[PDB]
Amino acid sequence: DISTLPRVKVDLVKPPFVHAHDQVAKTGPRVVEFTMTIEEKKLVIDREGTEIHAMTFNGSVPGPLMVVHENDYVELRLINPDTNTLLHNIDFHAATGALGGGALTQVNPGEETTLRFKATKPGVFVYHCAPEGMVPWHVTSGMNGAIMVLPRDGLKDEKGQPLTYDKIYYVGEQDFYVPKDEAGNYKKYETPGEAYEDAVKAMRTLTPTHIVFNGAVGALTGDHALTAAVGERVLVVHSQANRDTRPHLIGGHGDYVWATGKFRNPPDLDQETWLIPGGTAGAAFYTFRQPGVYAYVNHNLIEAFELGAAGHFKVTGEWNDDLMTSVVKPAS
Amino acid sequence: DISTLPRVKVDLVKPPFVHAHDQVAKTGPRVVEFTMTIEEKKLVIDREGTEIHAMTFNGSVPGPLMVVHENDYVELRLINPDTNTLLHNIDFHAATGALGGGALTQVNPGEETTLRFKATKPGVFVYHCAPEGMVPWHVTSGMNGAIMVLPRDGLKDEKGQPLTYDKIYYVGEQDFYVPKDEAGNYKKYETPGEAYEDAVKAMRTLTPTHIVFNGAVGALTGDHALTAAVGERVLVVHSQANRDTRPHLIGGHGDYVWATGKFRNPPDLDQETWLIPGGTAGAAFYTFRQPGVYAYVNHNLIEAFELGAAGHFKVTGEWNDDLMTSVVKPAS
Amino acid sequence: DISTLPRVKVDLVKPPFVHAHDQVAKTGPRVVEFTMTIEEKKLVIDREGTEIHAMTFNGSVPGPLMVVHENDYVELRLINPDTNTLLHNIDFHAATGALGGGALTQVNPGEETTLRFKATKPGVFVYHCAPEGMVPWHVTSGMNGAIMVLPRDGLKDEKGQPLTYDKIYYVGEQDFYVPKDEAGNYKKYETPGEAYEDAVKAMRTLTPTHIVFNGAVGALTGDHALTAAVGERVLVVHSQANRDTRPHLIGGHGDYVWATGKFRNPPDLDQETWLIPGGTAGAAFYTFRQPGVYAYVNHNLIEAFELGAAGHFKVTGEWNDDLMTSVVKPAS
Numbered sequence: 004d005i006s007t008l009p010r011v012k013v014d015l016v017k018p019p020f021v022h023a024h025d026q027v028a029k030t031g032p033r034v035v036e037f038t039m040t041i042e043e044k045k046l047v048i049d050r051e052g053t054e055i056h057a058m059t060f061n062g063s064v065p066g067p068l069m070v071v072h073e074n075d076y077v078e079l080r081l082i083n084p085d086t087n088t089l090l091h092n093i094d095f096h097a098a099t100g101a102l103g104g105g106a107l108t109q110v111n112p113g114e115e116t117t118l119r120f121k122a123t124k125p126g127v128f129v130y131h132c133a134p135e136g137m138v139p140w141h142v143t144s145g146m147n148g149a150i151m152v153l154p155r156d157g158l159k160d161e162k163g164q165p166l167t168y169d170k171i172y173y174v175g176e177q178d179f180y181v182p183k184d185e186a187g188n189y190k191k192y193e194t195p196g197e198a199y200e201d202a203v204k205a206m207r208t209l210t211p212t213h214i215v216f217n218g219a220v221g222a223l224t225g226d227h228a229l230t231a232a233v234g235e236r237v238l239v240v241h242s243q244a245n246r247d248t249r250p251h252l253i254g255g256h257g258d259y260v261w262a263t264g265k266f267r268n269p270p271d272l273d274q275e276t277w278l279i280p281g282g283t284a285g286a287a288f289y290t291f292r293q294p295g296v297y298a299y300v301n302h303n304l305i306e307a308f309e310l311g312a313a314g315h316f317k318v319t320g321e322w323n324d325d326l327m328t329s330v331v332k333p334a335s
Numbered sequence: 336d337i338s339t340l341p342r343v344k345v346d347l348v349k350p351p352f353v354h355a356h357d358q359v360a361k362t363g364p365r366v367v368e369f370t371m372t373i374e375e376k377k378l379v380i381d382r383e384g385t386e387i388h389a390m391t392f393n394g395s396v397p398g399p400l401m402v403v404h405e406n407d408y409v410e411l412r413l414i415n416p417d418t419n420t421l422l423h424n425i426d427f428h429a430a431t432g433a434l435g436g437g438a439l440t441q442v443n444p445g446e447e448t449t450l451r452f453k454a455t456k457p458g459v460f461v462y463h464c465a466p467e468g469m470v471p472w473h474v475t476s477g478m479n480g481a482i483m484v485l486p487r488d489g490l491k492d493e494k495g496q497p498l499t500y501d502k503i504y505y506v507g508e509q510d511f512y513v514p515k516d517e518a519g520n521y522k523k524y525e526t527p528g529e530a531y532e533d534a535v536k537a538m539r540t541l542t543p544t545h546i547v548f549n550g551a552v553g554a555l556t557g558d559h560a561l562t563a564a565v566g567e568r569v570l571v572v573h574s575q576a577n578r579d580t581r582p583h584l585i586g587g588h589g590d591y592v593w594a595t596g597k598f599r600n601p602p603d604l605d606q607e608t609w610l611i612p613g614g615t616a617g618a619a620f621y622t623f624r625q626p627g628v629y630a631y632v633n634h635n636l637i638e639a640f641e642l643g644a645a646g647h648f649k650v651t652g653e654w655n656d657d658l659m660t661s662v663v664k665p666a667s
Numbered sequence: 668d669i670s671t672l673p674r675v676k677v678d679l680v681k682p683p684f685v686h687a688h689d690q691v692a693k694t695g696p697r698v699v700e701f702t703m704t705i706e707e708k709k710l711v712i713d714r715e716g717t718e719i720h721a722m723t724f725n726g727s728v729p730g731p732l733m734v735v736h737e738n739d740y741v742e743l744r745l746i747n748p749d750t751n752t753l754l755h756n757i758d759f760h761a762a763t764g765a766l767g768g769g770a771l772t773q774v775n776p777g778e779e780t781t782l783r784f785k786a787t788k789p790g791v792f793v794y795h796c797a798p799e800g801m802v803p804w805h806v807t808s809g810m811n812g813a814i815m816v817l818p819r820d821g822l823k824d825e826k827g828q829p830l831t832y833d834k835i836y837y838v839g840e841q842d843f844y845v846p847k848d849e850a851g852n853y854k855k856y857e858t859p860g861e862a863y864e865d866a867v868k869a870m871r872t873l874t875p876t877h878i879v880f881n882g883a884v885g886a887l888t889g890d891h892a893l894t895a896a897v898g899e900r901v902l903v904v905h906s907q908a909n910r911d912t913r914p915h916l917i918g919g920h921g922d923y924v925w926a927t928g929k930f931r932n933p934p935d936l937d938q939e940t941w942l943i944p945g946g947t948a949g950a951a952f953y954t955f956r957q958p959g960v961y962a963y964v965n966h967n968l969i970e971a972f973e974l975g976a977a978g979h980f981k982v983t984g985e986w987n988d989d990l991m992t993s994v995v996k997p998a999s
């Protein structure tokens with residue numbers, strides 16, 4: 004009887020940050036309420052000024068990470084304002100039935116809907132838009148995110164002992180397929196609907212023009228680098244709604260990885276690189292042991308360093324010479 | 336001494352159905368006899384009327400699923416009638432030696448051969464044609480299928496308790512590479528041999544023109560949708576003989592998945608999407624909990640909704656509002 | 668205190684062979700010293716005489732396999748002679764900090780450097796060149812290899828019992844992207860630097876022109892086939908520094924596979940085919956049971972038989988008819 008359960012309202016934050024939550028559940032099951040507003044907007048995705056018409060949940064690519072516990076109810080109010088032009092919906096891979104909620108959430112511009120589902124399976128899961136006849140176009144225009152359903156007693160290692168993270172980041176990786184003219188220049192369109200048939204042709208090549216983290220080439224660099232300190236335990240959630248990726252922390256490892264993101268399974272240990280299949284979210288836990296700049300990449304290095312799938316951590320603290328040292332610096 | 340073992344003759348059925356078998360072995364080891372006849376035939380693969388010269392085992396793409404138990408002997412009579420034009424053979428990934436039987440089964444049109452092998456390893460496995468110098472052409476023309484070798488005591492969960500399926504379906508996913516003229520129109524050929532050099536060039540792009548389930552775009556839809564009922568336990572065997580795929584049940588999960596298809600390993604639990612590498616068969620077990628239409632896709636959504644890798648389940652029974660419900664239907 | 672540890676100098680051997688080592692450690696932790704010399708050289712990669720400017724560690728593609736034990740120190744002297752033209756470095760995925768050593772090992776032609784790191788995590792790991800702004804170009808020109816960090820007590824099966832290999836081979840798989848003129852003919856260049864902008868354009872297609880084992884189409888065939896005997900236990904280490912692969916032994920299996928190469932995890936059993944993600948090394952253990960020719964392939968069969976990713980084992984000994992036999996040889 005759901006009317007007797009506590010309700011809690013959560014305000015979502017922009018990726019790669021994550022809203023505040025408890026790892027170990029401090030209450031019984033709740034109905035957790037979220038609101039998202041669909042925004043169709045122009046996005047500049049690279050250093051050259053290439054623009055697309057992005058389709059977003061809450062104004063960002065990816066959409067924000069939602070965090071609940073196993074056997075909570077998720078109640079989502081989804082708003083499609085009349086400033087948009089397209090019909091949208093939402094499919095949660097975490098949910099059971101009705102095409103993951105897609106069949107129940109079709110909203111024209113000017114409409115809203117509220118869906119509730121029970122989070123019965125622990126893990127990270129993709130959510131994405133999926134309107135009949137236009138599914139890949141929506142998804143590859145940026146309309147995807149993830150939801151983390153924590154076990155009520157938090158995360159566990161391969162022996163069942165507690166694993167506790169100090170920080171958590173969300174990396175959404177996005178494949179874009181920007182249409183090109185005959186010579187290979189990217190095309191521009193006034194509206195999203197203009198691009199439709201050129202978008203289909205670009206997608207059918209199966210060759211993305213850009214692969215980015217957090218919506219743009221270089222989005223997780225500079226002043227937007229991820230930060231941590233030596234000794235901190237960091238959880239990195241990584242989603243790809245459409246195409247396989249293979250994350251790698253340059254200078255580190257995945258100490259504990261759930262590559263396909265489902266926490267009832269034991270993690271894989273000591274990974275150099277792991278495969279997250281398209282349509283999946285995964286999670287990697289790492290304890291930093293050395294200070295400095297780290298790069299976090301898709302380890303198809305072309306996709307990383309030419310197409311955009313690379314970000315940075317900046318880590319503070321003490322250098323450990325036992326782990327690594329230059330015995331003879333580069334010299335003639 | 337094989338002459339003292341019982342012999343049983345099995346008649347194969349068309350995919351996505353599977354011949355009758357026992358999950359838990361009701362007899363000791365047997366020699367299980369199968370016959371397959373190679374058919375080269377014209378196939379229409381999409382709604383536009385694109386035709387290829389398919390190369391098939393038993394007239395279907397994929398070839399039929401064979402089912403035996405661990406330590407049975409498989410005896411296959413392979414017939415290549417003189418109405419075909421090409422040399423064929425068979426390679427079982429389940430078998431040990433002689434290129435999986437490929438070296439022993441080369442049959443010109445007008446010839447037959449009988450191979451026997453012992454099924455020493457439990458799991459689902461690919462089989463495919465593999466004639467010297469023309470291996471990918473045969474495979475990507477549809478000449479592949481799968482064989483399931485059940486443990487003698489049936490399937491087990493991650494704790495070693497019995498898992499029993501009520502229904503079993505076989506989904507063969509096929510990458511096709513249809514040659515195109517300069518403008519991008521699909522070419523046509525009177526005979527398979529005509530296509531050879533254009534087929535090689537099309538394959539070398541590594542970009543399939545169509546990716547389909549059960550031999551055609553929309554083959555597992557409409558009146559050919561897969562069916563189940565709420566509460567039924569369904570095993571879905573999925574093979575891809577040449578290229579990676581990432582199955583996903585839209586509105587459901589893989590409760591227990593053997594992504595690389597080998598049953599001595601514990602299954603992965605609660606999967607949203609799983610990766611079956613090319614040259615592998617995998618298996619996913621799901622208990623349906625909600626009625627309605629489900630879509631089963633390769634979750635590269637371009638491959639699914641543009642190139643053809645999507646089918647449907649239609650599930651009957653009672654809706655459960657506790658799992659999912661529309662709190663406020665789409666409204667202005 | 669590292670000055671009190673024994674030092675041992677190892678001389679590396681050309682792939683696919685591996686330098687002599689102990690499986691179970693016969694000493695305490697050591698500093699293990701290796702030298703590698705960078706060689707930029709012309710390489711013929713296919714039967715047609717296509718040439719590239721390869722960038723190599725120690726003259727080979729892949730670079731040589733290094734073998735140490737968990738908690739040894741690796742000390743590498745890296746030499747870039749003044750006959751080379753480019754700046755190089757090395758990144759070990761086995762190492763912790765400084766971009767896997769990349770930040771500390773930048774060597775112009777005419778320079779050398781010595782790096783030491785502690786091998787804290789057991790497994791096979793990729794190493795590769797990774798100079799700032801030119802990472803994929805170096806890697807896809809062949810500048811990668813692998814390092815195996817054995818547990819001090821050797822390898823273990825899924826139950827923790829010892830697994831001992833009689834032979835070990837290293838297969839480096841390399842994706843090349845040879846630039847093409849308008850008609851599709853491969854281009855030629857006097858120097859590596861000439862190719863730079865054409866190399867970037869070729870890479871951005873994400874479509875390799877050649878995928879090879881040990882640096883050339885057909886390198887592991889003929890008199891260079893891998894050898895074994897019936898009853899031998901063989902470990903095959905396989906790396907791919909940039910792109911996913913799916914190894915398969917034709918006529919055999921992976922009895923025990925660490926697909927992502929990290930030995931603290933239990934192996935997967937009875938694999939037909941396994942996925943090694945790009946930027947990973949994996950390892951497969953097999954006991955041969957039948958004599959004859961086996962092919963070891965990437966089971967995207969186009970990549971194998973058209974693009975070059977295939978090699979051979981030749982296995983000697985006794986044929987076992989119980990496992991497989993021709994009951995009726997091919998006949999009219």
Ligand SMILES: O=N[O-]
Binds near residue numbers: 043044056057194195
């Ligand atoms: O600015 N809206 O695509």
Ligand SMILES: O=N[O-]
Binds near residue numbers: 083085112113667
């Ligand atoms: O956009 N309707 O609230």
Ligand SMILES: O=N[O-]
Binds near residue numbers: 245248
């Ligand atoms: O789905 N593409 O890896």
Ligand SMILES: O=N[O-]
Binds near residue numbers: 246247248303
């Ligand atoms: O091909 N998937 O990155």
Ligand SMILES: O=N[O-]
Binds near residue numbers: 254302758760767797
């Ligand atoms: O190890 N960095 O690609």
Ligand SMILES: O=N[O-]
Binds near residue numbers: 261266603604
């Ligand atoms: O999907 N389990 O990591």
Ligand SMILES: O=N[O-]
Binds near residue numbers: 375376527
């Ligand atoms: O109709 N045979 O290709």
Ligand SMILES: O=N[O-]
Binds near residue numbers: 414
């Ligand atoms: O086609 N020979 O039976």
Ligand SMILES: O=N[O-]
Binds near residue numbers: 967
């Ligand atoms: O083998 N192609 O995923």
Ligand SMILES: O=N[O-]
Binds near residue numbers: 580635
């Ligand atoms: O790229 N494999 O679907």
Ligand SMILES: O=N[O-]
Binds near residue numbers: 096102
């Ligand atoms: O969740 N359906 O792509």
Ligand SMILES: O=N[O-]
Binds near residue numbers: 597
């Ligand atoms: O291959 N084991 O699922």
Ligand SMILES: O=N[O-]
Binds near residue numbers: 708709
């Ligand atoms: O011959 N050096 O590229």
Ligand SMILES: O=N[O-]
Binds near residue numbers: 746749776778
């Ligand atoms: O190339 N310097 O030793």
Ligand SMILES: O=N[O-]
Binds near residue numbers: 303909910911912
């Ligand atoms: O990274 N390509 O499989």
Ligand SMILES: O=N[O-]
Binds near residue numbers: 910911912967
């Ligand atoms: O697409 N990787 O072989």
